[PDB]
Amino acid sequence: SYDKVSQAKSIIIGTKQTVKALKRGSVKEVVVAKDADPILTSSVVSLAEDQGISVSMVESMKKLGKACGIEVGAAAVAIIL
């Protein structure tokens, strides 16, 4: 849901920072794009499902970053609430 990501309060952008955010479990929601490389996505969804946190899948990574405030797209972005 791009709406949940364009909204909320505390958010973190980029795969590396989201898995690093998963290493402290201070994250409420995880949002991952489908069109992104699975080599980068599986690595985060594995830990995300392992932790017991909800995992979402969205179509484009570009509109994701656009929803995050980015001028890009992000392969994966976590709302840490």
Residues near RNA (CB under 7 A) are: 13-14, 16-17, 20, 62, 65, 68-74
Provide the pairing of β-strand 55-58 with 76-79.
unpaired
At its nearest, how many Å lie between RNA and the CB of residue 73?
Answer: 6
CB of residue 64 to RNA, shortest distance in Å: 9
The residue (of 20 and 34) whose beta carbon lies closer to RNA is 20
Q: What DSSP line would sit under the chain, residue for residue?
A: -HHHHHSSS-EEESHHHHHHHHTTT--SEEEEESSS-HHHHHHHHHHHHHHT--EEEES-HHHHHHHHT-SS--SEEEE--
Cβ proximity to RNA: between 4 and 20 the closer is 20
Q: Report in angstroms how near the CB of residue 38 gets to RNA at its nearest.
A: 18
**Choice between 23 and 34, CB closer to RNA:** 23
